[PDB]
């Protein structure tokens, strides 16, 4: 099992999954910790204005693996 608890920031996590284009989206909505990111549902993701389905799925998938080890 990879360890998904080793990121030191939301920005570092996004970079690792090639999603760093949404960095400002996460920041602007006050997702400043990975703890808060790990609690997100699809609705939270949609609220960020992330609209490509492929991006929503990558992020949701990464959030899931994270939540399982983090929460």
From Swiss-Prot:
Widely expressed. Heterotetramer upon binding of the ligand. The heterotetramer is composed of an ephrin dimer and a receptor dimer. Oligomerization is probably required to induce biological responses. Interacts (via PDZ-binding motif) with GRIP1 and PICK1 (via PDZ domain). The chain holds residues 919 to 989 of 998 of the full protein. Belongs to the protein kinase superfamily. Tyr protein kinase family. Ephrin receptor subfamily. It is found in: Cell membrane. This is Ephrin type-A receptor 7. Phosphorylated. Receptor tyrosine kinase which binds promiscuously GPI-anchored ephrin-A family ligands residing on adjacent cells, leading to contact-dependent bidirectional signaling into neighboring cells. The signaling pathway downstream of the receptor is referred to as forward signaling while the signaling pathway downstream of the ephrin ligand is referred to as reverse signaling. Among GPI-anchored ephrin-A ligands, EFNA5 is a cognate/functional ligand for EPHA7 and their interaction regulates brain development modulating cell-cell adhesion and repulsion. Residues 5-69 form the SAM domain. The modification Phosphotyrosine is found at residue 22.
């Amino acid at each position: 099992t990879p360890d998904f608890t080793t990121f030191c920031s939301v920005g570092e996590w996004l970079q690792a999954i090639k999603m760093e284009r949404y960095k400002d989206n996460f920041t602007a909505a006050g997702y400043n910790s990975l703890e808060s990111v790990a609690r997100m549902t699809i609705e939270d993701v949609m609220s960020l204005g992330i609209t490509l389905v492929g991006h929503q799925k990558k992020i949701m998938s990464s959030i899931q693996t994270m939540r399982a080890q983090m929460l």
